[PDB]
Amino acid sequence: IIGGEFTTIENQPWFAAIYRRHRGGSVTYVCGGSLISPCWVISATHCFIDYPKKEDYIVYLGRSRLNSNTQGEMKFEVENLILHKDYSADTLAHHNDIALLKIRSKEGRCAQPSRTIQTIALPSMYNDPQFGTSCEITGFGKEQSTDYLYPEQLKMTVVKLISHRECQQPHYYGSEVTTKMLCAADPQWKTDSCQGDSGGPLVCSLQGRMTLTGIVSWGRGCALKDKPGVYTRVSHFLPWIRSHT
Ligand SMILES: NCc1ccc(I)cc1
């Protein structure tokens, strides 16, 4: 997250931190995700497509720091890793950038809700907020495009939804942006998602309910004039989510 503010998992208790185990034992951060039910985390396919084996992954809930064991956290293996069969990528845009992880602890358990572990509601189909609505994004991704390191402490920021019509302008993204994607940005382009935020939640308030409106997917750079963050539009994937969970 470029700009914004530090936070803790209490302020986004559905946030899942996803890591990969390397061949020589090391463990590195991969991507964010969101707990949509006790056994299911939703994320982005592009996070996993290079290493698509479920046994490589570790998922944490209730975790506010990248490399420290937050009191109350839970650790899970990935029982199933479900990538979207119509995924594609070109130089910039990911299509159908959505993935499900069925989580299972070593004791064979799913998530147990606490002050630091809660689910996020899915949106109603084809029901998104209007352009200009402020939404929040959360993640452990880079604080500056040029950074080598990820922040140790979780971050969040606010971005505004951009109309498809605006996002499809040539000087924005043209036809790289589809109706299954949502664009969001800061009016001054000063805050955004960035590398390492992929898979994490774009959350908006619809009818007084926090709702998983988007999943962090792609962008040209980060916090860059005329280059919004692009998000998988969750409200256009409900049958896929329901059918795979
Ligand atoms: N600013 C949106 C964005 C940029 C790069 C990645 I990787 C993911 C999301």
UniProtKB/Swiss-Prot annotation:
Disulfide bonds join 31-47, 39-110, 135-204, 167-183, 194-222. Glycans are attached at residue 144. This is Urokinase-type plasminogen activator chain B. The modification Phosphoserine is found at residue 145. The chain holds residues 179 to 423 of 431 of the full protein. Residues 1-245 form the Peptidase S1 domain. It comes from the Eukaryota. The active site is at residues 46, 97, 198.
